[PDB]
Ligand binder design. Sequence first.
Ligand SMILES: Nc1ncnc2c1ncn2[C@@H]1O[C@H](COP(=O)(O)OP(=O)(O)NP(=O)(O)O)[C@@H](O)[C@H]1O
Ligand SMILES: Nc1ncnc2c1ncn2[C@@H]1O[C@H](COP(=O)(O)OP(=O)(O)NP(=O)(O)O)[C@@H](O)[C@H]1O
Ligand SMILES: [Mg+2]
Ligand SMILES: [Mg+2]
Lengths: 297, 297
Amino acid sequence: QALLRILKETEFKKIKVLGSGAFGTVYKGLWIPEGEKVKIPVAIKELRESPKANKEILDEAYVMASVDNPHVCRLLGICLTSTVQLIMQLMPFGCLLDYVREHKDNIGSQYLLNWCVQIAKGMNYLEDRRLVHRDLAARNVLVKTPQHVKITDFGLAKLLGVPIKWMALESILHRIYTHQSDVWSYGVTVWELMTFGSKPYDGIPASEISSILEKGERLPQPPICTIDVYMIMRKCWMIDADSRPKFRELIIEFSKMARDPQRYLVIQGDERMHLPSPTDSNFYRALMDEEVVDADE
Amino acid sequence: PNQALLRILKETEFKKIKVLGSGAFGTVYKGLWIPEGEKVKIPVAIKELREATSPKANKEILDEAYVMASVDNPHVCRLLGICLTSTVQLIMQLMPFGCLLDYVREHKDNIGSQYLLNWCVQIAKGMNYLEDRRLVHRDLAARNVLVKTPQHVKITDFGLAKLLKVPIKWMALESILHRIYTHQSDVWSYGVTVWELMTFGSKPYDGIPASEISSILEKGERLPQPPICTIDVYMIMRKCWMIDADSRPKFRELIIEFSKMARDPQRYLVIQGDERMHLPSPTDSNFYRALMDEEDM
Ligand SMILES: Nc1ncnc2c1ncn2[C@@H]1O[C@H](COP(=O)(O)OP(=O)(O)NP(=O)(O)O)[C@@H](O)[C@H]1O
Ligand SMILES: Nc1ncnc2c1ncn2[C@@H]1O[C@H](COP(=O)(O)OP(=O)(O)NP(=O)(O)O)[C@@H](O)[C@H]1O
Ligand SMILES: [Mg+2]
Ligand SMILES: [Mg+2]
């Protein structure tokens, strides 16, 4: 358990709020290693408040610390003295939802498909680990670089004790969460990416959602999407959980699509939106990502 | 040499935000890189050469920059980018910890034997790589080893001397006399660098004018045995300073001897409180790597 660093309060300082969610508040922070003059940027999430002892929180944290996948953010450190404060790598680019909105209509097919693949890969790994996210959404995918994204905030929901618009029918009705429910959330997440960050079911009250789903109503096909892409989303949204795609199936399908991106997504000016040149990619990795499917030309 | 390795930056791409220091070749700044079209500001190190350059002169500078950009080793810093402004600027990775010489001075009686020997091994590994590549540093010194993390150091400023007062006190006698530079002369410099670390940052030949160094060297005078250094350690250093270049140790040999010593560090360096001193720990190392050092090492 060298995986999880236990931090003293003196060791770090919250500098500014980056945002807040159902489970807590996230701050840009600095870590000051004892006996050193350096200040290292970090992200701190101070959890919203009942049930659990410090030992139990620690046990859960160890699990969070133990994940090892390029597309999943690993918990790095924890401070338990007052609030539970979780320390993680700070992502300057922020979350994927913010990124897509910011770059609306100016993101390539190659990027969109590759992100779908990456999100699937991280989710599949979580499935391998018998970890259910319970809160997947675009806001919960973090942009390490525009070419590399990572799932975040998994299992917070379990530790602390509501995203209805992202929830699977069964989750809403019976509060049951499973890998297959995560698949429903993935479908919504994909919809967000494809629409450049639109709010799902905008103007529809949370209470209505179950009733509309039961009627067989689903989120609309995004204009950029070919039917094949939309079909994948609809499948994630089937009422019977078992019928939905597996994350491993999803990795395969998106990857295939990624090979001929222009065929599956229709974007004006797509030809000009290709993935970074090797020179640019090498540079990004060196500065930000020391730790991708491509068109078959 | 792979051109994709060196990125050419527009002046508008980056900004200088602080002066880190100055050397014979140039001035080094902390900088921010703003990727075109993005919000983010990414910390970088910029070195701006002292002289203004002709466009003709720069082409030589560029060919050298490509080589500098080609170095691929965990113990050598790789040139990341260049801007051929009126005055040429090199962009590399920022190291918040700074140079090793400053670090040893700052932690002067508080550094353990395990760290010192490990640094020696690491510097040797980086130099061996350069030697393999038929590259001669010409300006090796403790000032020119950067601390990525306390557990990880990298050689820097490779190739600058070639593009460009000389650093007399780190120079082998043949280099002072005839301006002959070789891997074996690099070995001499390595010995001085080891001496700097072992003395926790002492100035070599302090109180002796640089103009008279060759004269003492011909007389057989050498840097004194450091208080913490055992005879076996001092002998390696002395060996680096033989008049006959071919008498000097090979970098490959140095890695082995230092590695062996590192295995039983308290045998080879005798330090007051060495029993007390922090020794790098897996929990600490993981945390540092996740925050600052994701490179294969
Ligand atoms: N590691 C990080 N680096 C940079 N920004 C982060 C990081 N983690 C989270 N954020 C941002 O912090 C803000 C708050 O995140 P969070 O508190 O998790 O709420 P949320 O995920 O948006 N909603 P929720 O589903 O309720 O958790 C969001 O803008 C995130 O994008
Ligand atoms: N990549 C870096 N990150 C942080 N500091 C750096 C970096 N590179 C250089 N520095 C610091 O910048 C300052 C200037 O270094 P430099 O200009 O190379 O002179 P020098 O190394 O002291 N002497 P010399 O290199 O022989 O001319 C030194 O304090 C270095 O430690
Ligand atoms: Mg979140
Ligand atoms: Mg230097």
